[PDB]
Amino acid sequence: MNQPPRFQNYFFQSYLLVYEDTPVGTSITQLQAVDPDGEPLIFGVVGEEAMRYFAVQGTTGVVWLRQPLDREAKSEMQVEFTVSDSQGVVKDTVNIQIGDVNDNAPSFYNQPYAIQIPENTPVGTSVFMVNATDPDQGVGGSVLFSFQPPSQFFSIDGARGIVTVTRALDYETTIAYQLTVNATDQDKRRPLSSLANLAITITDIQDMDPIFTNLPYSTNIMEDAPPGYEVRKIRAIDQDLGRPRGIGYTIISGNTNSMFALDYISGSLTVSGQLDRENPLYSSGFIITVKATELNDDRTPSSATVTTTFTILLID
């Protein structure tokens, strides 16, 4: 009594691994069967998808790949093979798993990457997160982030891609950082990587005292010089250039007999009294000190001040 053949390959009970990089023409396996009748057998494969991907040599059982594979497109196939004798056909299904190779670089997303942060951001603070996927499996899909070149002022966490400030920032030294993030997969035979720019703008904070312009201020004037005559226009600026504050100008000392007047807003230092060169109160001249004070929006004084001391002499 003729008996139908039986397939034997382990992979009918489990899966047949075919790596995605297998070239067209490669023999991916050989079907094996037993039949008790001393009779030739014919091997093949059925189904439109399977017959397009695989060729079976009728006579030997050898299975060949007809078509290129791509795990990231299709990771898996159900495939029915057949073995035939003089009596009929036997069919069994095989789950064919498409094995992964590291053939994709990491991809950044949510670009462009840029942030604005103020110069007083504390060391330790996390200011950005990069995002990247890699569709490969295992270590070939595991991403490590780093800065190339590395930064003295920022770090990025290898696994999480979180950027932190690692040294005190300062608008007065550096207003912009152009950093470069690297994303590398962990596949040790063939690693792959890609790059993204990260733009960090720095923002100004009031942390600089004002400073006097056009120094020095020591001036000689005619002893005859009348009331209203401008000795000098005094000028100071907020060194915080991003959102400067107004300045208030005062005379602190040495203005003997209220001889001079200093306009609070304009800095115009003028003669107010009648000059008398040899009066014993000021025969040596005037050693005047002047203060510029940064003002709050609402015109009340701040603590940011600067003083300069200069001499006014009187001439024949």
Residues that bind Ca ion (CB under 5 A): 2, 20, 35, 37, 70-72, 85, 100, 102-104, 134, 136, 140, 170-172, 185, 204, 206-208, 238, 240, 304
Instruction: Give 115's contacts (C-beta < 8 A, 6+ positions apart).
Output: 127, 128, 198, 199, 200, 201
User: Could you please report the per-residue DSSP string of 122-184?
Assistant: PTT-EEEE-EEE--S-GGGG-EEEEESS--SSEEE-TTT-EEEE-S---TTT-SEEEEEEEEE
Chain length of the chain: 316
Q: Name which of 201, 199, 183 is nearest 191 in CA terms.
A: 183
CB nearer Ca ion, residue 29 or residue 35: 35
Q: How far is the CB of 53 from Ca ion (least distance, A)?
A: 15
Q: How far is the CB of 302 from Ca ion (least distance, A)?
A: 8
What region does 184 belong to: left with phi over 0, alpha with psi -120 to 50, or beta? beta
Q: How far is the CB of 99 from Ca ion (least distance, A)?
A: 9
Q: How far is the CB of 171 from Ca ion (least distance, A)?
A: 5
Neighbouring CB atoms inside 10 A of 242's CB total 15
Q: How far is the CB of 72 from Ca ion (least distance, A)?
A: 4
